[PDB]
Symmetry: D2
Subunit: 68 residues, 4 copies
């Protein structure tokens, strides 16, 4: 056999290509989910950090007012 | 002034935060678009690469069979 | 001509396919950027909405404490 | 209790918000993974469709050339 073989080799190669690409897409999406959740938590911490300071601010505006 | 100052300092600090985060999102999306477009073209150059060989395959199959 | 014509037709149909696919990716990224910025701002409007209440909370805690 | 209570209510309401947003991020990424895998397969099906036709094209080019 020969052309029948190369005919069989390409078919399999092609079917192996699809399998490979679908996983790389999963990796690309996984890569991004990570970067995305990462920036999402940071943003969040800055916004919370705001809460833990918008606190002391409005706190000292009265927490000592009783002495001012 | 003073408490009114820290009050005004946080308000601006906040609005500055929003402006900042919204651009980091743009950088995150811009980052991914590039990664995404990158794999998309590779995947494609493999599938095309296939074309340029699934070619020489059926090619020498008959084009040579003619001499056989 | 004829087979040579079908050769040329497929080549053109190929280059045309590439162009179409690249824009669909763009429409896909565009679709996502929108959904992403959209949810991003909501999350934010809940975090701020929190600020505008974590405010009144500690407010009437002291703002009227002068009467308590 | 009361102010101490409204303090506890906000701390919980906050922790609850985080948990909610983190899942909406997941629903957002899941929505996109699907749109992405979906368009990735179509793209592919058009590239294969080109294979299963660039076939016949080069087929009849010779497969009948034996009679042309």
């Amino acid at each position: 056999a020969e052309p029948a073989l190369r005919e069989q080799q390409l078919q399999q190669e092609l079917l192996a290509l699809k399998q490979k690409q679908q996983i790389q897409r999963q990796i690309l999406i996984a890569e991004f989910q990570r970067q995305h959740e990462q920036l999402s938590r940071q943003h969040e911490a800055q916004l919370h950090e705001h809460i833990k300071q918008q606190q002391e601010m409005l706190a000292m505006k009265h927490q000592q007012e009783l002495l001012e």
